[PDB]
Design a binder for this molecule. Structure first.
Ligand SMILES: CCCCCCCCCCCCCCCCCC(=O)OC[C@H](COP(=O)([O-])OCC(O)COP(=O)([O-])OC[C@@H](COC(=O)CCCCCCCCCCCCCCCCC)OC(=O)CCCCCCCCCCCCCCCCC)OC(=O)CCCCCCCCCCCCCCCCC
Ligand SMILES: CCCCCCCCCCCCCCCCCC(=O)OC[C@H](COP(=O)([O-])OCC(O)COP(=O)([O-])OC[C@@H](COC(=O)CCCCCCCCCCCCCCCCC)OC(=O)CCCCCCCCCCCCCCCCC)OC(=O)CCCCCCCCCCCCCCCCC
Ligand code: HEA
Ligand code: HEA
Ligand SMILES: CCCCCCCCCCCCCCCC(=O)O[C@H](COC(=O)CCCCCCC[C@@H](C)CCCCCCCCC)COP(=O)(O)O[C@H]1[C@H](O)[C@H](O)[C@@H](O)[C@@H](O)[C@@H]1O
Ligand SMILES: CCCCCCCCCCCCCCCCCC(=O)OC[C@H](COP(=O)(O)OCCN)OC(=O)CCCCCCCCCCCCCCCCC
Ligand SMILES: CCCCCCCCCCCCCCCC(=O)OC[C@H](C)OC(=O)CCCCCCCC[C@@H](C)CCCCCCCC
Ligand SMILES: CCCCCCCCCCCCCC(=O)O[C@H](COC(=O)CCCCCCCCCCC)COP(=O)(O)O
Ligand SMILES: CCCCCCCCCCCCC
Ligand SMILES: CCCCCCCCCCCCC
Ligand SMILES: CCCCCCCCCCCCC
Ligand SMILES: CCCCCCCCCCCCC
Ligand SMILES: CCCCCCCCCCCCC
Ligand SMILES: [Ca+2]
Ligand SMILES: [Cu+2]
Ligand SMILES: [Cu+2]
Ligand SMILES: [Cu+2]
Ligand SMILES: [Mg+2]
Lengths: 66, 55, 551, 184, 139, 143, 299
């Protein structure tokens, strides 16, 4: 017929896309799980610094505890 | 103004040339502004690269 | 030992970081990237043309297209895929890694390299610009058979733009081939002998030789066609013997041209299989001989496209065409032998390479069926032929192209494409391709000729055409995940801080940072075999590879 | 101690350029086999009283071009300029001689639309004449570069590769001249 | 560089054999006699590999072993200046635009556009050739 | 001592590899949260012309003397402001060089301590660092 | 089943088609056997050679097996050599031409339809002889110095004309009537461009060329006989312009006595449609129908 032909052309690719996306995009990626405070800090020490401005006597500091 | 002359020589529909100029009258100036603004700043970066590194 | 790093790498350069580079760059790395984006835009443009035809062929009768528009569609669809997507991306991968593979800082002629890109971009635009003319673009097929292309039978300007656009792009391809031969001969690093280069480098050098034979004769033939159409010449006049004169020259160009877009993608999978199998490429020496034999044989088998003309020496071309299947079969045994007794992990670059093996074989098996004139007498100019070059091109210029893109994306960008999104893309592509192209074998055998805009309800072609139409739209929606992956992973992808994100790379590009510096190398290792990076990263395995090399 | 990169690039491209003339040669031979016994047919009357002196001038231009290479390899920029100017003049004479042949052939009824022989003859010889004109442009561009900077080895390399193209053009004409005016 | 031309001589022999075999096989028991289009293409295809192979044969026997032609060379053997490589140039895009202008004129058969394109190509090619040779302005 | 697949090159650079399908960075934070912190660090440093740094790990027993040593690793430590955080120590050590002295860091550093501590109580490490960097950078002048 | 292994190939109505179909089935069987072996090897290494979780050392680093490599270049050579021999055998039989055909058909292809002419009929049993050559209209095309061997490109003398001709129309599919069990000779000539003469039941096709002699093309092919009566569709296969898909034809096969009756009707001034009705046959084509002249459904 004619309604079935348009239904298969427009329907099957979308149905297949949804089924395959549910199979693959719902899996867990290689990204590490977000760290939680209640868990110990088992990761290696992290030092982050900005690259700006583009390129040792201290001037002071402060303390704090949460 | 030369759309009729361009249409005959370059095989373009006369109706198309009117609408190309009509739509381009609003779209092309926007494209050129964005390109020129990026181009002008990019030449500044090109001038800088010579300054800290030489020719 | 605390070394300061940014929390995340910079997503994009500042304002003005790219626009002046694009028009002034002589860097092969940027130019190679510029070839992938534009060739992937043309691939998208040409794919829309096939979607229009495939939608029209779903039902009998002309629903929205005319005969003229459909005729223009497969001509331009084929021209864009063969000359505007496949041929340039051969040099797209060449500028990405070949100087890295041979330990070179640059190509032989950096400015000539940039000239090829722009000659190719403006030449492709000229041919496509026929669609804005009232008559339309070329409608005589990409083969451009004579005297159908004569001014009497093709008076429109769309055909003339098609001829001149091909000439401009062909000049860029010739110059690119000249650049690649010179670069391999003169820019090799110390200790990198001819028989230590990667298979991809060998394939590109051999392919560039095929360009210099095929493309100049195509340019000569096109200029003769332009003389007929504009000067009233008699080059291709049937009374003068021009019907077969055009076919002979065009197929002397054309069949060497399809190995210009086959051998480099044979090299791409030849680079990927050893990495993910944790084993050295099987028959490294023999693969070079197989490539050379394929290149040599492809020059004297042109007339197997002209079986039905009744004007060619059948035994000569039939036999030599059968000979090509032997070195091609050798490549399968080396690729399987490489995977044999390995440690396969099946990442996305490896997954696409395996799809190549499955897809290319079925198209190859149809090739020997067509190589025999008796069987070709019934299936030529039909959809069985359409099924042959679609199984056998798709594997090389899509499956191996995607495998190379996933393989070398961390190298050229320093970011990893998402694997979950890549697996979805691969399976969508595989299922859609097979669904839309499996039934076309039956259609051509049943009696449906190629290049038909319409058929009749009593012809018995409706059911298989609908199935092919469903699969083609799956290929259309298979395009979205890969585009999304490239768009997202180019700024927010997983950072690459190592030289070899795949662990067991063999060629020299994996012995440098991701991305490589401006001159590609801050140091070079000792070159003693065809896996310098593997030796550099695993010195303890050097003794084992020499001892276990022979079975 | 290393191969000349520009020389390798020029020789590689020169080999590819020969396939362009292969297509033109195929057209001439295909039309010759369909001639039927008259090749060239009437009223085409080729005259060797003009082609032979024109061909000899082009051949002699190769010797003076080679002399400029020897001067270039010797480091004598002035000797290179003198020989390449002489080569340019004889190459220009070849173009004028071919055009003067073209004018008389057209007046006698041999034109591109006139006959199949006219189509192949003018395409084969005309495209070669275009290559000669391109070679004359290369001589002018190279000589203009000689007045811009001191004579360097890279500049001497550019002189050598230009002579490679000129020698290629001269050799192709000998094949064209023998095939058209003798193998009828 | 003995391997590079051995590649071309190997291709040369096969092309010469195919050209000879095809011409002879078309001369006999083939309609119309010798098929000239394929024979001419095959014969001059041998020429392409012959010229490149012969040149590489002459270059190879002049110079001794290069560091990349050694079976056990060290990275330090290649120390030194490699040569001149252009850092940047916008001339190549102008050459292509100049050539595309001529092609469009030839496609639509506009002699004025063809003449403009040829003049543009000559000027664009002149800029590329003279780019790294123009001296300082003299005032 | 080098990791598996890592080699020391002739130029002194380390050529490392990672297993296929694995990551080379693997910070235990979401990718988009890292982008926000990088923007806060990059634009906060630009607005104050002082390099802002963030440290996440231990700080010895007297946190204050560990931060001091840690700040020596930041490029241009004299013009740097380092925020050290020790989840196991549950403390917030902030140190800055002599070039930042007198530019308003004295008023902002306790505020950055207070901002970080408030978000840390809610179980948000990256959010606390982002908040602390923002308030400290806004309180430091390019002088 | 042969139909499943034929992959849509028609059974055939001529002995040449039967021989061609037999070659196709054997080659497909050979191709499938090779493909199954290679696919099995690919699937075997993909399922049993994957990296395990209990392996620490890299696998054996072998990359050269000379005895295996030499063996794997001879076996493919043997298969193609066997296939080439049977390929040469079949094409010699299919291209064989008898000096004494029983029916000679002039096939004239043009843009965009067909014309069928009866050049000569000479039954082997001598019950029907007819000479349909029309040389007083072939000499009227001469056009004549000339650009090509003294002739202008409008010479058209290469075409053949006959007294009884079936001319194709846009609203009438041309039907070619042939006798069953008789040797048929087809002479193909094209007016303008290249067309395609394909009957799927013949399992064979040849391109229709303008000036076939000047292009060294053998435009004549013969079938030994047609083994059954009926109607079979024919299509153009070579891209010939706008209406390349709308110039189909039909071949009607009837009994020798029926064919003789039909030719007499055509000689009596009857058109193709009414002459077919005179022998109790449908006047129009039944396998195909004329395409609607309208350019589409949106017109
Ligand atoms: C006809 C002429 C058309 C008019 C002129 C063009 C308009 C403006 C062009 C322009 O200014 O470009 C730079 C311009 C930026 O100028 P800039 O200031 O120098 O750069 C600032 C960036 O931060 C700089 O950041 P960055 O340099 O770090 O960028 C990194 C990355 C950023 O990546 C992304 O953001 C995503 C990239 C897109 C995804 C690709 C889709 C998947 C395809 C597969 C790829 C496989 C690999 O992008 C790249 O590196 C791509 C470089 C290669 C692109 C090749 C372009 C072809 C040049 C030919 C014409 C000139 O780009 C824009 O910002 C434009 C925004 C939107 C453009 C849409 C374009 C659609 C048109 C289709 C084009 C396809 C060809 C057909
Ligand atoms: C056409 C293709 C011809 C070029 C292919 C040769 C490849 C060799 C590679 C090479 O050295 O590249 C040089 C260089 C590549 O740039 P690069 O990467 O910086 O190379 C640095 C080298 O390492 C350092 O090399 P260099 O800086 O010493 O310059 C080398 C250059 C220096 O040569 C010269 O002294 C002047 C030669 C310039 C070419 C003249 C063009 C003539 C156009 C005539 C148009 C009207 C007809 O020598 C050559 O390129 C040898 C070729 C000899 C000229 C033969 C061309 C005749 C054309 C025949 C027309 C048909 O490009 C050029 O100078 C020439 C290529 C320009 C091609 C123009 C494309 C348009 C042609 C369409 C014409 C149709 C009009 C209608
Ligand atoms: C070489 C590579 C190549 C590739 C990749 C393809 C890709 C496809 N082609 Fe092929 N094709 C050829 C080479 C190729 N083709 C050649 C050489 C011919 C000869 C034609 C001739 O006779 O002249 C041919 C002709 C041809 C035919 C024969 C038609 C006929 O004769 O009547 C068919 C039949 O369906 C076909 C279909 C397809 C389909 C469905 C795809 C699928 O790849 C398409 C799906 C891909 C897409 C990319 C879809 C696009 C999706 C989008 C979402 C685009 C959106 C973009 C914008 C909005 C800007 N093409
Ligand atoms: C990627 C491009 C590509 C490649 C690689 C090939 C490879 C082959 N092709 Fe071709 N071909 C095309 C692109 C390609 N082709 C295109 C685009 C057309 C139509 C153009 C047009 O009309 O527009 C075409 C058309 C075409 C024709 C003409 C069809 C016709 O129009 O009638 C023929 C006939 O000989 C042919 C045969 C072959 C053969 C034998 C191979 C062989 O190289 C394949 C051999 C491979 C194998 C055999 C598999 C591996 C082997 C083994 C595992 C051992 C098995 C051994 C045996 C079975 C003996 N193809
Ligand atoms: C100066 C550049 C400025 C460009 C800037 C960007 C703006 C571009 C906007 C795009 C314009 C497209 C809209 C035109 C839509 C429109 O109205 O036109 C139609 C016909 O479609 C078309 O043409 C569409 C094709 C348009 C081409 C794309 C534009 C890009 C060009 C401009 C690039 C040029 C190259 C650069 C120049 C170099 C200079 C260097 C800087 C129908 O007309 P008609 O002709 O009546 O057809 C009848 C049927 O309709 C009816 O059914 C029936 O079938 C019949 O009656 C039929 O006749
Ligand atoms: C660029 C194109 C050049 C123009 C070529 C041209 O138009 O020449 C054809 C023309 C014949 O004109 P015709 O109609 O025979 O009338 C002549 C009466 N004196 O006159 C000729 O036959 C002259 C042909 C001159 C050969 C030029 C070769 C051009 C090669 C590239 C094409
Ligand atoms: C942004 C402008 C885009 C231009 C428009 C093209 C953008 C095209 C994308 C949507 C339209 C195509 C989807 C539907 C087509 C269809 O079924 O029938 C529609 C019409 C009845 O049939 C046509 O024939 C339409 C035009 C054919 C394409 C012109 C090719 C352009 C040549 C290039 C030189 C463009 C340069 C851009 C230059 C960019 C700006 C430079 C300053
Ligand atoms: C076309 C003129 C032919 C004259 C016959 C003799 C042939 C040799 C001429 C030598 C010219 C030297 C000029 C020179 O050194 O100036 C140089 C600069 O020349 C140029 O930049 C342009 C030269 C002309 C370009 C030609 C383009 C078109 C070619 C047409 C070919 C038919 C000297 O520059 P300078 O200021 O001294 O650094
Ligand atoms: C991924 C494999 C897809 C296979 C599609 C082919 C289906 C053929 C069905 C034919 C039905 C005829 C009525
Ligand atoms: C190498 C030839 C492959 C043939 C594949 C055929 C696909 C099956 C189609 C079934 C149609 C049933 C009506
Ligand atoms: C058809 C009779 C023999 C024709 C032979 C033509 C050969 C032409 C080659 C000339 C090569 C000159 C260098
Ligand atoms: C029976 C005559 C044989 C002629 C063979 C000629 C081979 C091709 C010649 C090409 C010459 C190109 C310059
Ligand atoms: C009577 C029709 C039966 C259908 C036969 C289908 C054959 C399918 C073969 C699939 C081969 C895939 C490589
Ligand atoms: Ca339809
Ligand atoms: Cu082929
Ligand atoms: Cu037709
Ligand atoms: Cu047709
Ligand atoms: Mg065909």
């Amino acid at each position: 017929s004619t309604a079935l032909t348009h239904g298969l052309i427009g329907g099957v690719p979308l149905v297949l896309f949804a089924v395959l996306a549910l199979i693959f995009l719902t899996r867990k990626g290689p990204h590490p799980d977000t760290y939680k405070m209640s868990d110990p800090w088992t990761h290696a020490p992290i030092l982050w610094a900005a690259e700006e401005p583009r390129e040792v006597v201290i001037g002071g500091g402060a303390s704090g505890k949460w | 103004c030369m759309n009729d002359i361009i249409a005959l020589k370059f095989h373009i529909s006369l109706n198309a040339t009117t609408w190309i100029g009509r739509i381009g009258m609003v779209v092309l100036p926007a494209i050129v502004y964005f390109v020129a603004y990026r181009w002008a700043i990019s030449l500044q970066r090109s001038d800088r690269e010579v300054l800290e590194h030489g020719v | 030992e605390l070394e300061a790093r940014r929390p995340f790498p910079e997503r994009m350069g500042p304002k003005g970081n790219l626009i002046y580079k694009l028009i002034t760059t002589t860097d092969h790395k940027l130019i190679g990237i510029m070839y992938c984006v534009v060739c992937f835009a043309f691939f998208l443009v040409g794919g829309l043309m096939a979607l229009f035809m495939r939608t029209e062929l779903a039902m009998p009768g002309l629903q929205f297209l005319s005969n003229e528009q459909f005729n223009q569609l497969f001509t331009m669809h084929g021209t864009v895929m063969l000359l505007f997507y496949a041929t340039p991306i051969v040099f797209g991968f060449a500028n990405l890694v070949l100087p890295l593979q041979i330990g070179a800082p640059d190509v032989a002629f950096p400015r000539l390299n940039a000239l090829s890109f722009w000659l190719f971009l403006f030449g492709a635009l000229i041919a496509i610009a026929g669609f804005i003319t009232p008559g339309g673009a070329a409608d005589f097929g990409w083969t451009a058979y004579s005297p159908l292309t004569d001014a009497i039978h093709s008076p429109g300007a769309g055909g003339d733009l098609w001829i001149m656009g091909l000439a401009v792009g062909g000049l860029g391809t010739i110059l690119g081939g000249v650049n690649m031969i010179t670069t391999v001969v003169c820019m090799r690093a110390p200790g990198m002998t001819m028989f230590r280069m990667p298979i991809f480098t060998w394939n590109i050098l051999v392919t560039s030789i095929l360009v210099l034979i095929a493309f100049p004769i195509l340019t000569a033939a096109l200029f003769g066609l332009a003389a007929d159409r504009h000067l009233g010449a008699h080059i291709y006049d049937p009374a003068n013997g021009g019907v077969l004169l055009w076919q002979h020259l065009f197929w002397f160009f054309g069949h060497p041209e399809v190995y210009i877009i086959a051998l480099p993608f044979f090299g791409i999978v030849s680079e990927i299989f050893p990495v993910f199998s944790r084993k050295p490429i099987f028959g490294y020496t023999t693969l070079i001989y197989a490539t050379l034999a394929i290149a040599a044989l492809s020059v004297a088998v042109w007339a197997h496209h002209m079986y039905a003309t009744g004007a060619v020496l059948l035994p000569f071309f039939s036999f030599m065409t059968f000979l090509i299947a032997v070195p091609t079969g050798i490549k399968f045994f080396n690729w399987i032998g490489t995977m044999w007794k390995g440690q396969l992990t099946f990442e996305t670059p490896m997954l696409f390479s395996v799809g190549f093996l499955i897809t290319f074989l079925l198209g190859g098996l149809s090739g020997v069926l067509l190589a025999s004139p008796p069987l070709d007498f019934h299936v030529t100019d039909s959809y069985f032929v359409i099924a042959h070059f679609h199984y056998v091109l798709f594997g090389t210029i899509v499956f191996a192209t995607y495998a190379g893109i996933y393989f070398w994306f961390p190298k050229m960008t320093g970011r990893l494409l998402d694997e979950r999104l890549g697996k979805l893309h691969f399976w969508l592509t595989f299922i859609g391709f097979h669904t839309t192209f499996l039934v076309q074998h039956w259609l051509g055998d049943e009696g449906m000729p190629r290049r038909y805009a319409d058929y009749l309800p009593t012809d018995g072609f409706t059911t298989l055409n609908v199935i092919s139409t469903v699969g083609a739209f799956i290929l259309g929606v298979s395009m979205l995940p890969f585009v999304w992956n490239v768009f997202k992973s180019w700024r927010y992808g997983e950072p690459v801080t190592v030289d070899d994100p795949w662990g067991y790379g063999n060629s020299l590009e994996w012995a440098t940072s991701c991305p490589p510096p401006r001159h590609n190398f801050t140091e070079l290792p000792r070159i003693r075999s065809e896996r310098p990076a593997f030796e550099l990263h695993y010195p303890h395995m050097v003794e084992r590879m020499r001892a276990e090399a022979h079975v | 101690n290393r191969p000349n990169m520009v020389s390798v690039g020029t020789i590689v491209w020169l080999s590819s350029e020969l396939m362009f003339f292969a297509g033109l040669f195929a057209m001439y031979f295909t039309a010759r086999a369909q001639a039927g016994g008259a090749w060239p047919p009437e009223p085409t009357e080729l005259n060797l009283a003009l082609a032979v002196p024109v061909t000899l001038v082009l051949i002699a231009s190769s010797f003076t071009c080679q002399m400029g290479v020897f001067a270039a390899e010797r480091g004598d920029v002035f000797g290179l300029r003198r020989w390449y100017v002489i080569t340019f003049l004889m190459g220009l004479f070849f173009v004028l001689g071919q055009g003067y042949e073209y004018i008389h052939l057209v007046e006698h009824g041999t034109t591109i639309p006139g006959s199949a022989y006219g189509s192949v003859f003018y395409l084969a010889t005309g495209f070669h004449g275009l290559h000669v004109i391109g070679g004359l442009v290369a001589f002018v561009l190279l000589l203009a570069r000689t007045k811009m900077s001191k004579f360097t080895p890279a500049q001497a390399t550019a002189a050598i590769v230009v002579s490679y193209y000129w020698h290629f053009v001269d050799i192709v004409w000998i094949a064209l001249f023998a095939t058209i005016y003798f193998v009828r | 560089m003995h391997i590079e031309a051995r590649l071309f001589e190997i291709l040369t022999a096969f092309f010469a054999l195919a050209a000879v075999v095809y011409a002879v096989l078309t001369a006999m028991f083939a309609t119309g006699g010798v098929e000239w289009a394929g024979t001419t293409a095959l014969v001059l295809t041998t020429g392409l590999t012959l010229i490149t192979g012969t040149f590489f044969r002459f270059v190879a026997r002049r110079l001794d072993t290069r560091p990349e032609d050694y079976e056990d060379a060290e990275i330090s053997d290649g120390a030194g200046e490699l040569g001149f490589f252009a850092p940047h140039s916008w001339w190549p895009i102008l050459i292509s635009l100049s050539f595309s202008t001529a092609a469009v004129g030839a496609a639509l058969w506009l002699p004025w556009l063809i003449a403009a394109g040829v003049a543009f190509v000559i000027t664009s090619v002149c800029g590329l050739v003279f780019e790294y040779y123009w001296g300082p302005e003299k005032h | 001592d080098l990791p598996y697949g890592s080699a020391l090159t002739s130029s002194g650079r380390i050529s490392a590899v990672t297993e296929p399908g694995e990551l080379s960075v693997h910070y235990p934070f979401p990718t988009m949260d890292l982008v926000v912190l990088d923007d806060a660090l990059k634009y906060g440093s630009r607005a104050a012309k002082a390099r802002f740094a963030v440290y996440i790990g231990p700080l010895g027993a007297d946190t204050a003397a560990t931060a001091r040593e840690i700040l020596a690793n930041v490029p241009t430590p004299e013009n740097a402001v380092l925020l050290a955080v020790s989840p196991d120590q549950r403390a917030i050590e902030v140190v800055y060089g002599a070039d930042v002295k007198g530019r308003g860091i004295e008023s902002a550093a306790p505020l950055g301590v207070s901002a970080a501590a408030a978000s840390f109580k809610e179980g948000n490490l990256i959010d606390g660092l982002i908040s602390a960097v923002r308030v400290m950078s806004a309180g430091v002048s390019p002088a | 089943w042969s139909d499943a292994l034929a992959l849509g190939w028609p059974t055939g109505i001529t002995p040449e088609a039967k021989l061609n179909r037999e070659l196709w089935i054997g080659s497909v069987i050979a191709s499938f056997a090779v493909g199954a072996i290679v696919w099995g090897l690919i699937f075997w290494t993909s399922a049993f050679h994957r990296k395990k979780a209990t392996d620490t050392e890299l696998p054996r680093q072998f990359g050269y097996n000379m005895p295996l490599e030499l063996t794997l270049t001879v076996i493919p050579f043997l298969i193609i050599s066997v296939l080439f021999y049977f390929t040469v055998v079949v094409q010699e039989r299919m291209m064989h031409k008898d000096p004494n055909p029983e029916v000679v058909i002039d096939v004239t292809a043009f843009q965009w339809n067909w014309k069928f002419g009866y050049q000569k009929i000479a039954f082997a049993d001598g019950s029907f002889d007819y000479d349909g050559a029309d040389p007083e209209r072939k000499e009227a095309m001469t056009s004549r110095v000339g650009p090509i061997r003294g002739m202008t490109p409008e010479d058209r003398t290469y075409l053949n004309f006959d007294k009884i001709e079936t001319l194709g129309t846009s609203s009438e599919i041309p039907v070619l009537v042939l006798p069953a069990g008789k040797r048929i000779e087809f002479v193909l000539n094209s007016a303008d461009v290249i067309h395609g003469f394909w009957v799927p039941e013949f399992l064979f096709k040849r391109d229709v060329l303008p000036e076939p002699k000047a292009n060294n093309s053998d435009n004549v092919f013969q079938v030994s006989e047609i083994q059954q009566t009926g109607a079979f569709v024919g299509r153009c296969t070579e891209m010939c312009g706008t209406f390349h898909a709308m110039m189909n034809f039909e071949v009607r096969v009837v009994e020798p006595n029926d064919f003789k009756a039909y030719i007499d009707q055509r000689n009596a001034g009857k058109t193709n449609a009414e002459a077919l009705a005179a022998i109790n046959q449908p006047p129009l084509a039944i396998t195909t129908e004329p395409f609607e002249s309208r350019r589409g459904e949106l017109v």
